[PDB]
Design a protein around this ligand. Structure first.
Ligand SMILES: [Cl-]
Ligand SMILES: [Cl-]
Ligand SMILES: [Cl-]
Ligand SMILES: [Cl-]
Lengths: 99, 99
């Protein structure tokens, strides 16, 4: 698809068997999902931006479906106000900015 | 151009006659620039980020060039960690997300 930017670019994702809405975020290095359980090992991490930092759990090798496109990568889980698909997974679905 | 996302989508902007680097950010409603002098009056605005809320200065109708494309619109000024081009100006330059 081609997604215009008049509104927030929200899509449906599937992660850990759950459907969620998430923001396609070219301004995020990483993918950050609101609190949920994921399988396997994790390690703590601090992520930063406007307003400061939050602590998250880093899970590696997690499969997501993003608007029907499957990808795999690291997923961070923590108290983000919005579910975020960041560049580490946007690359895997072939997403580009165009103007 | 068509910009892939393996690295941060940084471009050159021109504002107040000065060249700066800024991040094309589909996860930002608004455009937020680090502390600098801009003409005219400003209004108060609260913005939310990954770490919390911060107060910024809202300057309306500011001339700004983004990757060679001219825009005139609202620029927020405050302690952002990186200069951010948000959707208010991405729409002015004709940017879309594509996959
Ligand atoms: Cl979708
Ligand atoms: Cl925290
Ligand atoms: Cl990854
Ligand atoms: Cl505007």
């Amino acid at each position: 698809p081609q997604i215009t930017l008049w509104k927030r670019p929200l899509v449906t994702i599937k992660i850990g068997g759950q459907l969620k809405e998430a923001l396609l975020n070219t301004g995020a290095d990483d993918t950050v999902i609101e609190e949920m359980s994921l399988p396997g090992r994790w390690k703590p991490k601090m992520i930063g931006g406007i307003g400061g930092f939050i602590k998250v759990r880093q899970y590696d090798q997690i499969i997501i479906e993003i608007a029907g496109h499957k990808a795999i990568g690291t997923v961070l889980v923590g108290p983000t106000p919005v579910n975020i698909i960041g560049r580490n997974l946007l690359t895997q679905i072939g997403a580009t900015l165009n103007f």
